[model samples]
Target: GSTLDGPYQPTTFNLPIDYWMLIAPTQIGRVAEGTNTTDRWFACVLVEPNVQNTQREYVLDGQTVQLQVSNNSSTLWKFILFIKLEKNGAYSQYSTLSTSNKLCAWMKREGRVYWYAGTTPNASESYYLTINNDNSNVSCDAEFYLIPRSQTELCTQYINNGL
Candidate 1:
């Protein structure tokens, strides 16, 4: 009864502007204080569409997408989902989303991506995407949404529950 059964291939495409990428931290490292880690990357998932943003774009379940890290000079760092890759021996069968080269599959349920902590795909956890004004000091569980194409006002409203 697993939802992971499929010949789902890795998808790569330019993430559109309207949709926001909501990423949350599943591990206590970069987002956490005093972890002493140099790398500051995080995992993400596409937000589920609702009545507020009914026209919001989205990625389908079982479809894997390539994500890119934003440039360092950019004031706001946003993760971009890029082009689809055909499944082959070079790629992984499960969806792999990570800062490191770690290979792991992700599961999509109720339109949200779930990271399985281990080899077993049964138990998983979810966290709210949060934000911090200071940026570098962004805490774990902070609300952070990647709004593409500089749609800051619209995304801000959406985050404030006003969208």
Candidate 2:
């Protein structure tokens, strides 16, 4: 039996080549401005050699599909999760090396992704999806929850009310 308290137990997921994943927070609620909390932050990752110009598709929870891996024995599957941020009311990207750092996500306008944990233009951090089995399992250090695209506006308003 595993207790709900404390850090999450290690889990594994096999990510195929050329696919991407969106990692969002599990908890949904209001977020205060100028605060560092894992309220609505989100991140994304694209497998290497993603040369296609197709619209980005993400692998969500409760969905599974067959995918392929590289044949080279010396190849390491590297996955970079980019934290989505807002810069001057536009979509931007950033990465950081801080472990156990808290972040909050908010949107100032409709149909835009805006998140801030500390400053602008350099907010939030990025993480490399770590693996345990020969570097096959692509996983993050924190837990993720599903958030609907339609609710982004409401969530953003919740954070703004705190300001």
Candidate 3:
């Protein structure tokens, strides 16, 4: 997360990227290289590497990453997101990189926020990334209780990478 202009408000992004932009996306969100999501229009504060240098880290046999989506819009939207974890860009259920479960946001109201966590996914074996959207219902974002494998390593490396 980057420094935000103000309180992060959910947004319907209108942009393009790699595979995600054309995956029959049900709603609008920003993507870069189809591997990452970005909402330049919304306001959000960086949770990690901001206030604490994000020293917290964890390794997983698959852990849950939680996200809170809020419908700051005037109209209500049902926040539904489908998530998948890919190993080095490969998709598989047995690849040791995957989500524990998937669910639909239950009737999020305007200015209301909801909580959802990606399934407890394996920690090692390969790298992983998640993709999500509200399907035009809820416009929201996520935060992790534990850092993802790559990010953890990155943060660790930042400290011990012989810098």
Candidate 4:
């Protein structure tokens, strides 16, 4: 995540998700489009490419997830991608992806960071992107998301056809 200026306090964002997009719901967070809940602000669609779109076959199925983040702010920002295999589970049940060191910061306007290994998501789990806003006046022009390889392959196919 990109950080704005300030010695920001660690803020816990109890973000809300509906139809797959995480919502900040206020000026504390920003979205490029749609103030409504159903808007396609910071949302993504996941699919098991070759498999039919069926329940238990997709949507949190045991598929490897591709984690990506873009940081554009000019301050140090730490990020953790956590998943709860069961809804409302204890913190211990949460699976986390973070830098080996907690103090690692992400702020590079050039390229995005990615994770392809050990990023598989469990079924029926809730996902969250926790940004360690260590700065006092925290702000970010960044996003973190997960997508399955299947969808990635399909998108590449479409793009290649267009090209």
lDDT of 4 by residue, 1-163 (tens): 3222232333323222211111111121121111111211122222111333232211112233344333232332223332332332311212222211111121211122121112222111223333232121212223322123334432222222211
lDDT against the true structure, per candidate, is: 0.26, 0.28, 0.23, 0.23
Runs in model 3 deviating more than 4 A are: 1-7, 16-138, 141-163
Over 58-98, each residue of candidate 2 has an lDDT whose tens digit, in order, gives: 33222221222121212221122243222212212343211
lDDT of 1 by residue, 1-163 (tens): 2111122222232222233433333332122111001222223332221112122222222333332222232122222222122222121122222222111222222323333221112212232112111122212222233444345334333332222
Clashing pairs in 3: 8-43, 18-34, 60-123, 62-121, 62-122, 77-137, 78-137, 100-119
Off by over 4 Å in 2: 1-101, 104-138, 155-163
- Best candidate per TM-score, number? 2
How much is 45 displaced in model 3, in angstroms?
Answer: 20
How many clashing residue pairs appear in each of the predictions shown?
13, 1, 8, 4
Instruction: Judge candidate 3 at residue 68 and give its lDDT.
Output: 35
Candidate 3, 27-52: lDDT as tens digits: 32211111122321111111211132
Ranking by lDDT: 2, 1, 4, 3
TM-score of 3: 0.16
Give the residue spans of candidate 1 off by over 4 A.
1-22, 26-74, 89-156, 159-163
The candidate with the higher TM-score, 2 or 3, is 2
Stretches of model 4 off by over 4 angstroms after superposition: 1-4, 13-82, 89-102, 105-163
List clashing residue pairs in candidate 4: 7-135, 7-136, 8-135, 8-136
User: Model 1, residue 89: displacement in angstroms?
Assistant: 8.3
Q: What TM value does model 2 have?
A: 0.22
Superposed Cα deviation of residue 83, candidate 1 (Å): 3.6
Model 2: which ten-residue window has the lowest total lDDT?
28-37
